[PDB]
Design a protein around this ligand. Structure first.
Ligand SMILES: [Mg+2]
Ligand SMILES: [Mg+2]
Ligand SMILES: [Mg+2]
Ligand SMILES: [Mg+2]
Ligand SMILES: [Mg+2]
Ligand SMILES: [Mg+2]
Ligand SMILES: [Mg+2]
Ligand SMILES: [Mg+2]
Ligand SMILES: [Mg+2]
Ligand SMILES: [Mg+2]
Ligand SMILES: [Mg+2]
Ligand SMILES: [Mg+2]
Ligand SMILES: [Mg+2]
Ligand SMILES: [Mg+2]
Ligand SMILES: [Mg+2]
Ligand SMILES: [Mg+2]
Ligand SMILES: [Mg+2]
Ligand SMILES: [Mg+2]
Ligand SMILES: [Mg+2]
Ligand SMILES: [Mg+2]
Ligand SMILES: [Mg+2]
Ligand SMILES: [Mg+2]
Ligand SMILES: [Mg+2]
Ligand SMILES: [Mg+2]
Ligand SMILES: [Mg+2]
Lengths: 53, 210, 102, 203, 147
RNA sequence: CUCUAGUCUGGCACGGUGAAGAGAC
RNA sequence: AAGGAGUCUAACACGUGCGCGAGUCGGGGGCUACGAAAGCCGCCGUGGCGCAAUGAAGGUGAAGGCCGGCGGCGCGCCGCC
RNA sequence: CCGGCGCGCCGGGCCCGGGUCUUCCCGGAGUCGGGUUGCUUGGGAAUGCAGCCCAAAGCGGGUGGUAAACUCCAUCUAAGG
RNA sequence: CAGUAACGGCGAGUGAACAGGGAAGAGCCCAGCGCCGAAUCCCCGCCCCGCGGCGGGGCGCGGGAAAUGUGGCGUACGGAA
């Protein structure tokens, strides 16, 4: 009966989702995560809907 | 020993509380079990609604909640008798019945009667024999569009009557609300002793005549 | 005068129309029937009277009503049951007089 | 019906007829053993009300128990501890003498099931009860769907688990503000829930 | 985070922050609220005045629901209805006054603390206080009682 | 200091059938 | 040589960081490999705490001032629009 | 391999309801309850249980969180499953 | 709800219930009172079938249980004719 679980406020969870999403469209922040994206054409890498098929 | 400033706390940890500790590590396991049991029941009663029988319009007692409305246990026998539904047949078509309920008012009684009528208009009844239709049942075109309802049947929603901005009249401007509250409280508090003093005044003064 | 519904006072409460229904059949219980009255007083002439109420009728015959009430109250319990026992135990005393008078 | 007459007849226990019958029957049952089989119910309307049906497999046993309270079974004085628990004489058993009589019948007849029991007489030192017993393996009980619930293994020793009426009266259960301490299964079930600390995952 | 606690910096120090002379003994003054009359009396009187004794009448079967009476002040009276309820009466010329049902918003008694804007109201409430009804009559308004 | 086995004593019940007598109000 | 002693849970206080803000919080419930996680519900906000105190309690419950007219007291005051 | 979900047939059962009037009937006793004793409960002039004594009624009985009397109300139907 | 009403050398400490939101949700049967020719139940022998949770119909001037009360209608939501 140690407190294993923590509860986080929903607005802070959504705020962290927004901060993680907005950092994924920046060059230096994804380079500093180490992802090899030097030849990626655009950083919001959006593809067409036949990829789901 | 107490510190400088704080509360006087009384922790209820003087018994052997560590033996009777209820941990909740099977809470996400019981949620899945309840969900699977719910879906198995919903597949078992295939065109019947998943919530179950229809629950009646019920006022709440005990003045903190007397303005809200609620789903009760069952429709009363007076309500079923006015609606024209037999009490031993109502449970077969998904109408929840309890015989303990009384009907003190008229407005809630007729509201539940209208509730029964509107559910009876929405009921799509299959024949007891699938190969041969009967008299009091739905036609074949409605049985093929008959689906399963999700959520409570005819959900109960608290409605508030909207009122126009009215022009205040002169007699509404003369109503003293606080004075009426104080005098009504005083007249409720002093009703018995005033009647007893009037009885003594009528009893002492009738001795004079005799 | 301008009157309003109030939560306090002598006629407090929200105003509804009180409908009239048949009385609930659980409320019927405790009523004598012409058959169970016949059975109970039939058992009464067969059996007779208890020794304490036999003493209480002797107490009521000499018109000691307060002592008869106190004795019955001490013997059976509550004051309501004592009054109800004393009323029937004096009605049977009056019935024994009108049977032997003529 | 005669049963209504016998019922109102047994309510006049202070009358001459009933004080004669109760005294001679108490004398008769005092000369027998502490537990023996009655050939038929002594009080048939009350056995009938408690659930006796006069058919094959329904057994009546008459039994006597000793009256009084419960002396604490401890050597001479010497119940060792604080002054609260020095009581030995004026203590009382938590279960009724009828409930003791039911389990003394049911332990000696373990192949049968206790249904109910009723009072038939008493004196200064004995109280006399008659216990209704059902054979759960007779075919008249097995094939009757009204009384085939007693044949189930759930109802083994109802009189020992306190599920008959007499042992049921001592558990303090019922609906109301007077029986708050047995909300749940029982008194111990209420205590377990009230003294069980619920420690959630997220507190 | 036990790495941030005081214990990790107390390794090597003999008494572990608890003293060489007065040791960390088990219960050197009693357990819990012991000695409120006798040897913790100065703390109990200097910080908890009134803790010992009986005041007032007992009420055996008290249920909190009978005395349920939530209050709203008149400075919150206009927040119960929408903004287009308030501004339509301001632009209104026929003198019609909007009706505020505080029992619908979940209040029983109206107290009068703040100001009211100079426009007519019809307040329906279960209870009213005296200054609450006079501040409504002074701005020009109705205090309707409901049950 | 506060209790307690045991024991003495009084009441109620098990607990009836008659004869006399002395009684209080 | 190895093991070896301020730990865990609950409650409270104060400080500090974050989010929202007269509101805030889904912790219980429900929907839809890691995942027993994460996401969502708003007529699921019930309910908790805060937004109102005081009295043992019945109960009560958080600025006013000036001017004009009228009535009363003998120029001021009180009551009244 | 086992079981469920169904159809046809045989041998059986069951020979059935609803509504309005009219006439009838209806309840659990050494139990409730009272006193006292002991344990128990948050239950406090006694919450529950038990021993002993007393011991019911039928427009009755129980409950209505302060003992008791009177008078109205409200709400169930204990002592069988 | 709530560490609340309340209990407590009213000290230490102990301590529910109702209302409300959900998970689940299902209701019923006797005795009595009555009416039906005991209209009810169990066991043994034979015939055929089922036969590995001992049952079904057909015979037996076969035996018992039961009127000191079995079965059908019928149970407080009223019920019966
Ligand atoms: Mg210190
Ligand atoms: Mg002690
Ligand atoms: Mg140092
Ligand atoms: Mg040291
Ligand atoms: Mg230190
Ligand atoms: Mg120290
Ligand atoms: Mg020192
Ligand atoms: Mg310490
Ligand atoms: Mg001292
Ligand atoms: Mg080492
Ligand atoms: Mg802080
Ligand atoms: Mg009892
Ligand atoms: Mg004990
Ligand atoms: Mg105790
Ligand atoms: Mg009363
Ligand atoms: Mg009272
Ligand atoms: Mg029952
Ligand atoms: Mg029952
Ligand atoms: Mg709180
Ligand atoms: Mg003290
Ligand atoms: Mg305790
Ligand atoms: Mg509840
Ligand atoms: Mg639900
Ligand atoms: Mg019969
Ligand atoms: Mg019932």
């Amino acid at each position: 009966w140690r407190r294993w679980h923590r509860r986080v406020n929903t607005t802070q969870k959504r705020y962290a989702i927004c901060s993680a999403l907005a950092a994924s469209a920046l060059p230096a922040l994804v380079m500093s995560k180490g992802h090899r994206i030097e030849e990626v054409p655009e950083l919001p890498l959006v593809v067409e809907d036949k990829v789901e098929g | 020993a107490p510190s400088r400033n704080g509360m006087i706390l009384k922790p209820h940890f003087h018994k052997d509380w560590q033996r009777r500790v209820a941990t909740w590590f099977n809470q996400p396991a019981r949620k899945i079990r309840r969900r699977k049991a719910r879906q198995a029941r919903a597949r078992r009663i295939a065109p019947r609604p998943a919530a179950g029988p229809i629950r009646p319009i019920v006022r709440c007692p005990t003045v903190r909640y007397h303005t809200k409305v609620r789903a009760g246990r069952g429709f009363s026998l007076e309500e079923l008798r006015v609606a024209g539904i037999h009490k031993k047949v109502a449970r077969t078509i998904g109408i929840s019945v309890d015989p303990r309920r009384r009907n003190k008012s008229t407005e809630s009684l007729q509201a539940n009667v209208q509730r029964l009528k509107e559910y009876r208009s929405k009921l799509v009844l299959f024949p007891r024999k699938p190969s041969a239709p009967k008299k009091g049942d739905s036609s074949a075109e409605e049985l093929k569009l008959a689906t399963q309802l999700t959520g409570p049947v005819m959900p109960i929603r608290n409605v508030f009557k909207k009122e126009k901005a009215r022009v205040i009249t002169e007699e509404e401007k003369n109503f003293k609300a606080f004075a009426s509250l104080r005098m009504a409280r005083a007249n409720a508090r002093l009703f018995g002793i005033r009647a007893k003093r009037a009885k003594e005044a009528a009893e002492q003064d009738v001795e004079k005549k005799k | 005068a301008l009157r309003y519904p109030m939560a306090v006072g002598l006629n407090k409460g929200h105003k509804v129309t009180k409908n009239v229904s048949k009385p609930r059949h659980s409320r019927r219980r405790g009523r004598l029937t012409k058959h169970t009255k016949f059975v109970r007083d039939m058992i009464r002439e067969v059996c007779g009277f208890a020794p304490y109420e036999r003493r209480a009728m002797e107490l009521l015959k000499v018109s000691k009503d307060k002592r008869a009430l106190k004795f019955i109250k001490k013997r059976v319990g509550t004051h309501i049951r004592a009054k109800r026992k004393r009323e029937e135990l004096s009605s049977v005393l009056a019935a024994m007089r009108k049977a032997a008078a003529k | 019906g005669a049963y209504k007459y016998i019922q109102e007849l047994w309510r006049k226990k202070q009358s001459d007829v009933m004080r004669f019958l109760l005294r001679v029957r108490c004398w008769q049952y005092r000369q027998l053993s502490a537990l023996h089989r009655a050939p038929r119910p002594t009080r048939p309307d009350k056995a009938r009300r408690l659930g006796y049906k006069a058919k094959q497999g329904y057994v009546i046993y008459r039994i006597r128990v000793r009256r009084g309270g419960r002396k604490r079974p401890v050597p001479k004085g010497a119940t060792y501890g604080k002054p609260v628990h020095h009581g030995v004489n004026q203590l009382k058993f938590a279960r009724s003498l009828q409930s003791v009589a039911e389990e003394r019948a049911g332990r000696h007849c373990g192949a049968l099931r206790v249904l109910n029991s009723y009072w038939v007489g008493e004196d200064s030192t004995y109280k006399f009860f008659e216990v209704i017993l059902i054979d759960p393996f007779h075919k008249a009980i097995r094939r009757n769907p009204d009384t085939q619930w007693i044949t189930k293994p759930v109802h083994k020793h109802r009189e020992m688990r306190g599920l008959t009426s007499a042992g049921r009266k001592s558990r303090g259960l019922g609906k109301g503000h007077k029986f708050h301490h047995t909300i749940g299964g029982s008194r111990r079930a209420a205590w377990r829930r009230r003294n069980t600390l619920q420690l959630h995952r997220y507190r | 985070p036990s790495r941030l606690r005081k214990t990790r910096k107390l390794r090597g120090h003999v008494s572990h922050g608890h003293g060489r002379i007065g040791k960390h003994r088990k219960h050197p003054g009693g357990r819990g609220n012991a000695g409120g009359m006798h040897h913790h009396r100065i703390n109990f009187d200097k910080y908890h005045p009134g803790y010992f004794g009986k005041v007032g009448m007992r009420h055996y079967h008290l249920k909190r629901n009978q005395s349920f009476c939530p209050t709203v002040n008149l400075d919150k009276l206009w927040t119960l209805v929408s903004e287009q309820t308030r501004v339509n009466a301001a632009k209104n010329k026929t003198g019609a006054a909007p009706i505020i049902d505080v029992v619908r918003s979940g209040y029983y008694k109206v107290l009068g603390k703040g100001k009211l804007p100079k426009q007519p109201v019809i307040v329906k409430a279960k209870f009213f206080s005296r200054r609450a009804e006079e501040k409504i009559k002074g701005v020009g308004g109705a205090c309707v009682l409901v049950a």
